[PDB]
Write a protein that binds this ligand. Structure first.
Ligand SMILES: OC[C@H]1O[C@@H](O[C@H]2[C@H](O)[C@@H](O)[C@H](O[C@H]3[C@H](O)[C@@H](O)[C@H](O[C@H]4[C@H](O)[C@@H](O)[C@H](O[C@H]5[C@H](O)[C@@H](O)[C@H](O)O[C@@H]5CO)O[C@@H]4CO)O[C@@H]3CO)O[C@@H]2CO)[C@H](O)[C@@H](O)[C@@H]1O
Ligand SMILES: [Cl-]
Length: 414
């Protein structure tokens, strides 16, 4: 007997970490667990192929944003019995509870595995040379621009690159997701889709949503983001934060874990970045503080022939002990609220800011169509980055792009 599980690269040796995690399960149950690791760029397609063909694992990891769309295909086993065993609705942040199901659906089709949310890493050394107070830089949108202007005029140079630092690094390539932009949209009072009149519509083109996007993209148009970042994707901008080219960069909590790991083992501990590492939450916008709150869930294909064992492995992976163990390996946060108290998370000062930032965690609605919305958003957003790369993003050019993304998104939804 072999359980087949699919995971994404959640830690530097993802398959080994996962196998070490489930070994007590294997012994207690006298079964073997076979792990496949799919990269984040293709995971969506091979998972969707598995759902359409009925050929695949027992369990798969899903990004919290995917659960809506796979559940709607009617390929996932109810796990209301697993969630019940784990403590039920009371044992999660509503931010996590909303991702166990298709929005509006009767029954849970996903168990929360881990959580993650976005904040700003900075270089403690570089802000201190600019004479920038991080409590003021990251307090509001004026604070931030003031932070970046001072960071741009600083004579500071990285010890190892003996070169000045990019003030903000963010990617300008067509994004995979609105993960980077969403907090700007939200903090301006805006949103990506809106529920009204018994329908979801695009709000990408609202005054609020454009205010947020333009504020964010125009930072790049004012020389806070160097041209070279406009041509890179998330993973490139992250190597560059690690190799000492950027003073400020928005990411998830895993980069705290990787900073303690040697470059050989898939981290950056030897880098200066790692020795001089700060975290601050997104600054408050005109209409609130928000950050993108996400993570991954586990779901059982209803065409699995190992559904009993696969539920005990769900109950295993979702329960306090394996919750603690895997968050430590991956540098993510447990999904189960009780596991957040562990001193491993509480007494790590950088991970503490992510934990306090989580009060302002916001999520995407779990709509069957959510992938289709996000894909059209990001396509249009990519055409906005290309105008920034010309110095040609104006308010009206951005309105025009988002009125076109809203026309296509509306069609998709209706
Ligand atoms: O929208 C989908 C879904 O997204 C979730 O968010 C995901 C996000 O989509 C992913 O892109 C992101 O991926 C990061 C991994 O979590 C994290 O493990 C990884 O960290 C290390 C990695 O562990 C390490 O092996 C890697 O090493 C490279 C070296 O640095 C290079 O020198 C060498 O050449 O190549 C190796 C690679 O073999 O480096 C990285 C970076 O330090 O970083 C990934 C990239 O950012 O994970 C997010 C969280 O899971 C979101 O949560 C869901 O809600 C959403 O639905
Ligand atoms: Cl973006």
């Amino acid at each position: 007997k072999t359980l087949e599980v699919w995971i994404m690269p959640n830690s530097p040796q993802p398959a080994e970490d996962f196998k070490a995690l489930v070994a007590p399960f294997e012994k207690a149950h006298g079964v073997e667990v076979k792990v496949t690791v799919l990269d984040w760029g293709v995971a969506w397609t091979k998972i969707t192929t598995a759902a359409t063909s009925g050929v695949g694992p027992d369990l798969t990891q899903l990004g919290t944003t995917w659960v809506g769309a796979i559940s709607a295909m009617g390929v996932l086993e109810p796990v209301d019995d697993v969630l019940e065993a784990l403590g039920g609705e009371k044992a999660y942040l509503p931010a996590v509870w909303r991702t166990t199901r298709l929005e509006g659906a009767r029954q849970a089709t996903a168990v929360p595995w881990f959580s993650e949310l976005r904040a700003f890493y900075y270089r403690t050394d570089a802000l201190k040379a600019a004479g920038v107070n991080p409590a003021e830089m990251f307090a509001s949108w004026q604070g931030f621009e003031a932070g970046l202007a001072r960071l741009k005029a600083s004579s500071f140079r990285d010890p190892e690159t003996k070169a000045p630092l990019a003030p903000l690094c963010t990617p300008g390539r067509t994004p995979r997701t609105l993960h980077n932009a969403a907090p700007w949209i939200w903090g301006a009072g805006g949103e990506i889709v809106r529920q009204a009149g018994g329908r979801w519509q695009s709000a990408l083109n609202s005054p609020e949503s454009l205010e947020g996007l333009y504020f964010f993209l125009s930072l790049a148009q004012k020389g806070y983001v160097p041209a070279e970042s406009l041509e890179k994707n998330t993973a490139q901008i992250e190597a560059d934060f690690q190799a000492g080219k950027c003073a400020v960069f928005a990411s998830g909590p895993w980069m705290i874990q990787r900073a303690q790991v040697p470059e050989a083992k898939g981290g950056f501990a030897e880098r200066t970045a790692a020795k001089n590492l700060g975290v601050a939450p997104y600054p408050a916008g005109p209409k609130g503080r928000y950050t993108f709150f996400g993570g991954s869930n586990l779901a059982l294909f209803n065409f699995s022939k190992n559904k009993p064992l696969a539920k005990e492995l769900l109950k295993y992976l979702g329960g306090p002990e394996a919750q603690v163990r895997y968050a430590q390996m991956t540098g993510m946060l447990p999904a189960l609220r009780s596991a957040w108290s562990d001193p491993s998370f509480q007494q790590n000062p950088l991970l503490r800011t992510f934990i306090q930032a989580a009060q302002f965690g916001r999520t995407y609605p779990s709509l069957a169509g959510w992938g289709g919305v996000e894909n059209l958003a990001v396509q249009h957003l990519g055409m906005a980055w290309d105008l920034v790369a010309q110095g040609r993003l104006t308010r009206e050019a951005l309105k025009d792009l988002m009125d076109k993304a809203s026309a296509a998104i509306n069609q998709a939804l209706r």
